Design brief:
Chain C: InterPro entries: Centromere_Cenp-M, P-loop_NTPase. This is part of a larger assembly, with seven protein chains of seven kinds. Chain D has four helices and no strands. By secondary structure, chain D is mainly α. The longest helix of chain D has 39 residues. The radius of gyration of chain D is 23 Å and the shape is flat. Classes of the chains: A mainly alpha, B mainly alpha, C alpha/beta, D mainly alpha, E alpha+beta, F alpha+beta, G mainly alpha. Chains in contact: A-B, A-C, A-D, B-C, B-D, B-E, C-D, C-E, C-F, C-G, E-F, F-G.
């Protein structure tokens, strides 16, 4: 069913994150001082923003088609919350 | 009057009084509590008359804004912001909006709605004072400031929607702002047309709420009227950026395609068609029409218990949809 | 030892915050104010006088660090300047915040707040103001700080700490 | 009771997606006036791509809900359910709100 | 315009720009117009500091009528029952008099004095002092009809101060506010007064600290010989003719370490309350006492810029 | 008590508490109001290294209940864990005014 | 090895829990 697929996806994400964490721990620590903090932080911001921009480009909407009943339940919950929001706005 | 010695006397008295009576600033007095609120109400009621703000209030805001926690005197403090004199946006940004934005992103949803209300009133006041001047910085410089303010609040709105996980209570205020924004050229005769970003448009178009769709239809109709009016006068006065026209055209084509044209797959919603076959939709062209949109589920189910029910929708009171339908087809 | 941002794997629906300062009573009151309310996540608060911390192995990963400075005391300012040299540069990318106390009573102040403004600007981080002795003011700061913590831990989709860097950036 | 696991398990999958993106961005990176402009360009680009991704995801979800809701419309008018009740209340609200909006316009 | 210049001046008061350094005060000969018998009267007295907004339509030509009206008001105020005529001779007397040679530059307005004399010459009961020394910042933003005297000093009972302040506020449309000195400014005063050169050291230099410990209370006093303090200052002073923030920090740090070596107590966690030296002494509540007639103008100028900052 | 909060530096707090209890005893302190010290020691800190004469100082402590304010300094964080013996030796030495030489 | 509890164990736990030198100064002066 859908539950098994979602669980398995969770284990793949966990395994990938464990591997990435293991790989990331081999870098040495860098500490700053009052004289050089600003420029170093600016350079690091440039590098990290450039890194994350491509990661967001790689992202694609994943399907994982769910069953029809869960969609109905989610719609019911959404309508229920919409009711309270509407009374407040009124 | 606009006499100088009286202005200076009032300035000194009011600035000293506000400094001494404030709550979180200059010895942090908490005993006055109600007295300060009453004094602020009197000041607000005095500057609603005279149609402008005092110079002392601006200095008090610029001094005491960094130390404010965002809850002490929310109503009166945020009502003082609306009466800030017109000035270039770049100058007052570090003084006011950098603190307001930092307080904005980390607070509750009611604070966000409050600041959206106050910014809408500020925009209305700035526009009111600008319109009378053209009857009498250059005009090109003046419109740049208001356009930057509109873009700033659009950025605020998009990030706020992302943080709050698409709450409709916030979306009502966000659309309330653009209701005032949409009609600037007709109301105040100032040549300026600014559209809301696609993040707001496609979050309003796909909302479950029906009042959101009604308001969006009304807003689009007002944009089309204003853009039609603006183009006419240019020929006699022969400059609006053309990109506005194509952007509005894309919005309009997507909107009509989703509703009753059965062409949902526009440039904005470019979902990959072969995924839809994997998704399981047999006929997606008519999935988001008036009949089958999840927003109109209530109306469809109600009418099913009772074909040609568009009049039923109009009777239920979808006036903006009626205007948009009548003007678009003809 | 040098504290590291991504040393350990995250826990399930858990967020952790570390408060570093000299006044212990203020830290305890702030922690209580943060924890009193109910939220969707599970919260943990760690209290420390300065960095580096005493060595331990069971410590979960830290998501956000708040440096609280007393404007009525030179000792606290010196302590924070000393503590700032034991955290790696990677940890200042949207995961550090400065909190300043005592600007309400100006007569007691031993530190000109141009100093804390310049320090916060130098280390590319936000600067917050609150008088922690007043309970009404402390209650709202606790909630603001909880929301920032939830953003930093990854519990709001689409917004991360590096994104939070641009939201809170000061023009000058 | 079964739906309880759905809510908790869905929340876990959404959190892990956000947390995994941070490690991947950090590893990739590991491998004054002039600097400041490039940062602003980069963050504008990031916002632009994020908005489009969100729009696509939301549109797909709404289309799925619409088709599934259509396929089971007949069962809904049989009614005798809490969801059917909620719909009757929703019709009452929308009407009042729209009337108030028109009055405010005038 | 003046209103716009005032607005701009206040709004450029931001915390991005660093505060400047200060020149070491230089002994200056008293002006020839200065009256020695009044100056001797002003010294060695304990004053209370206030800040004052500009006075609207104050004239130096007619001080006699001001004195007579204030006399009638004071006399009527004490006996709340019965009426008082203006020109009579009462138990107490009020005199308006003008000080000379007390202005920093040629642009500043002249100082003046107000006294309450118990006739029975008489014996002075209360005195108040209006002055402006080096006030070119405030004078630019204010029109001609006003008079700028940002600093007010009072010596006597507070119940008389309330009456005189009420009369002035009603008559000239001004605002009296107390002036306080915080630990930051007071530690700058200590170093600047130590830097000044003195031929003879009449009194020792002392600092007073307040320890915050919940329900309990504690005060610590620290006295040191003036020559020893001068040597300690000369150890750290390396910028010729100027005092820098780093030098002040080092000068305070030396005392902190000396105290901590003996008593194991962090004097940095405490709050500095009073500083007394050979030229003057000050308190955080806003009290000043001046002992040297050579360095009067420097003290008045420091306090004047402090009061100017408090109203703008 | 609210086990979510984790107190680091707990061992230092317990140690300073133990040291304060040992040094100041457990009896009610006798009530004094003043104490005076006269110092004639050399300055030892580059700074005044060549100077060979003592630095002359006189300091006083005043409190409504002295020896009770002093007891609370170390737990509050204003002093080190053991105070100097000059402060914890008032009643044992029956001394109130002191003189110290190098 | 305090048995790093498996995610599954920790998850169920949380779900279930939603119901609860004294000689150196006497030698210098």
């Amino acid at each position: 069913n859908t539950e098994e697929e979602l669980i398995r996806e969770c284990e793949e994400m966990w395994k990938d994150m464990e591997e990435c964490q293991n790989k990331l721990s081999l870098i040495g620590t860098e500490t700053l001082t009052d004289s050089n903090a600003q420029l170093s932080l600016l350079i690091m911001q440039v590098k990290c923003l450039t890194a994350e921009l491509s990661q967001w480009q790689k992202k694609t909407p994943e399907t994982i088609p769910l069953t029809e009943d869960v969609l109905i339940t989610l719609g019911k919950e959404e309508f229920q919350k919409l009711r309270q929001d509407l009374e407040m706005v009124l | 009057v606009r006499d100088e010695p009286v202005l200076l006397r009032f300035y000194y008295w009011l600035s000293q009084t506000l400094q001494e009576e404030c709550i979180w600033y200059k010895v942090n007095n908490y005993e006055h509590g109600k007295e300060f609120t009453n004094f602020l109400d009197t000041i607000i009621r005095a500057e609603c008359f005279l149609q402008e703000g005092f110079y002392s209030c601006e200095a008090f805001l610029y001094k005491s804004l960094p130390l404010w926690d965002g809850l002490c005197c929310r109503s009166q403090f945020l009502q003082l912001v609306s009466w800030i004199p017109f000035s270039s946006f770049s100058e007052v940004k570090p003084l006011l909006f950098d603190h307001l934005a930092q307080l904005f992103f980390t607070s509750t949803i009611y604070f966000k709605c409050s600041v959206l209300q106050s910014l809408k009133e500020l925009l209305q006041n700035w526009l009111l004072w600008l319109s009378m001047d053209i009857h009498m910085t250059t005009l090109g410089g003046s419109m740049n400031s208001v356009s930057k303010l509109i873009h700033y609040v659009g950025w605020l709105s998009t990030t706020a929607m992302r943080l709050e996980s698409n709450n409709t209570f916030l979306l009502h205020f966000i659309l309330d702002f653009y209701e005032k924004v949409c009609d600037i050229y007709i109301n105040y005769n100032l040549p300026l047309v600014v559209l809301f970003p696609p993040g707001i448009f496609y979050s309003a178009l796909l909302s479950l709420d029906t009042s959101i769709l009604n308001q969006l239809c009304f807003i689009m109709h007002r944009y089309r009227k204003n853009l039609t009016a603006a183009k006419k006068n240019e020929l006699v006065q022969k400059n609006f950026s053309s990109k506005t026209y194509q952007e509005f055209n894309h919005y309009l084509t997507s909107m009509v395609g989703c509703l009753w044209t059965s062409k949902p797959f526009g440039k904005g919603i470019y979902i990959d068609p072969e995924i839809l076959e994997k998704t399981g939709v047999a006929e997606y062209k008519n999935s988001l029409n008036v009949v089958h949109h999840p927003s109109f589920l209530s109306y469809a189910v109600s009418f099913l218990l009772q074909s040609w029910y568009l009049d039923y929708l109009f009777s239920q009171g979808l006036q903006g949809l009626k205007l948009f339908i009548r003007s678009s087809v003809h | 030892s040098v504290l590291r941002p991504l040393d350990k794997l995250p826990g399930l629906n858990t967020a952790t915050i570390l408060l570093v300062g000299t006044e212990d009573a203020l830290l305890q009151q702030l922690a209580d104010s943060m924890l009193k309310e109910d939220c969707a996540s599970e919260l943990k608060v760690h209290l420390a006088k300065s960095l580096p911390l005493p060595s331990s192995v069971n410590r979960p990963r830290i998501d956000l660090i708040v440096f609280v400075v007393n404007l009525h005391s030179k000792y606290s300012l010196q302590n924070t300047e000393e503590s700032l040299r034991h955290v790696d540069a990677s940890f200042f990318l949207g995961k550090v915040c400065f909190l300043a106390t005592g600007a309400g009573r100006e007569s007691h102040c031993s530190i000109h707040r141009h100093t804390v403004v310049k320090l916060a600007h130098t280390y590319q981080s936000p600067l917050l103001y609150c008088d922690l002795e007043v309970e009404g003011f402390r209650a709202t700061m606790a909630q603001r700080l909880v929301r920032v913590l939830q953003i930093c831990a990854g519990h709001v989709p689409g917004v991360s700490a590096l994104n939070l860097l641009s939201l809170l950036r000061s023009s000058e | 009771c079964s739906e309880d696991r759905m809510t908790l398990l869905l929340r876990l999958r959404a959190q892990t997606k956000q947390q995994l993106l941070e490690y991947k961005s950090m590893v990739d990176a590991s491998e004054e006036k002039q600097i400041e402009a490039k940062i602003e360009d980069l963050e504008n680009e990031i916002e632009e791509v994020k908005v489009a991704f969100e729009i696509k995801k939301l549109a797909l979800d709404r289309m799925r809900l619409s088709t599934a809701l259509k396929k089971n419309l007949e069962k809904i008018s049989r009614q005798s359910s809490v969801l059917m009740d909620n719909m009757k209340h929703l019709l009452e609200l929308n009407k009042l709100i729209m009337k108030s909006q028109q009055e405010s316009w005038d | 315009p003046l209103q716009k210049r005032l607005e701009s001046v206040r709004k450029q008061s931001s915390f991005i720009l660093t505060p400047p350094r200060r020149k070491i005060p230089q002994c200056s000969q008293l002006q020839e117009d200065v009256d020695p018998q009044k100056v001797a009267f002003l010294l060695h007295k304990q004053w209370t500091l206030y800040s004052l907004t500009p006075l609207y339509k104050f004239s130096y030509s007619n001080l006699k009528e001001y004195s007579r009206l204030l006399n009638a008001f004071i006399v009527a105020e004490k006996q709340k029952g019965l009426a008082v005529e203006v020109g009579e001779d009462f138990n107490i007397k009020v005199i308006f008099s003008t000080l000379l040679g007390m202005k920093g530059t040629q642009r500043d307005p002249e100082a003046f004095l107000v006294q309450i004399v118990s006739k029975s010459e008489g014996k002075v009961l209360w005195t108040g002092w209006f002055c402006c020394v080096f006030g070119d910042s405030l004078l630019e933003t204010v029109s001609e009809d006003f008079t700028c005297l940002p600093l007010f000093l009072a010596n006597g009972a507070e119940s008389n101060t309330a009456i005189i302040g009420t009369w002035f506020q009603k008559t000239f449309d001004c605002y009296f506010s107390p002036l306080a000195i915080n630990a930051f400014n007071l530690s700058w005063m200590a170093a600047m007064w130590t830097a000044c050169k003195m031929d003879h050291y009449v009194a020792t230099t002392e600092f007073l600290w307040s320890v915050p410990c919940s329900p309990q209370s504690l005060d610590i006093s620290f006295a040191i010989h003036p020559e020893d303090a001068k040597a300690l200052w000369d150890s750290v002073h390396k910028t010729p003719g100027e005092v820098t923030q780093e030098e002040v920090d080092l000068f305070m740090d030396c005392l902190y370490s000396h105290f901590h070596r003996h008593f194991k107590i962090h004097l940095s966690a405490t709050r500095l309350v009073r500083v007394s030296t050979s030229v003057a002494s000050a308190h955080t509540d806003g009290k000043i006492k001046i002992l040297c007639h050579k360095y009067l103008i420097g003290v008045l100028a420091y306090l004047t810029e402090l009061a100017i900052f408090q109203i703008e | 008590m609210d086990s979510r909060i984790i107190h680091e530096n707990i061992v230092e707090k317990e140690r300073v508490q133990r040291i304060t209890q040992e040094t100041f005893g457990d009896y009610p302190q006798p009530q004094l109001e003043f104490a005076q010290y006269k110092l004639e020691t050399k300055f030892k800190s580059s700074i005044l290294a060549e100077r060979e004469e003592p630095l002359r100082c006189l300091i006083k402590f005043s409190s409504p209940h002295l020896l009770e304010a002093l007891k609370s300094l170390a737990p509050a964080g204003i002093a080190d864990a053991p105070l100097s013996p000059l402060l914890t030796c008032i009643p044992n030495k029956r001394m109130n005014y002191f003189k110290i030489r190098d | 090895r305090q048995a790093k509890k498996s995610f599954s164990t920790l998850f169920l736990e949380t779900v279930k829990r939603k119901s609860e030198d004294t000689k150196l100064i006497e030698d210098e002066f």
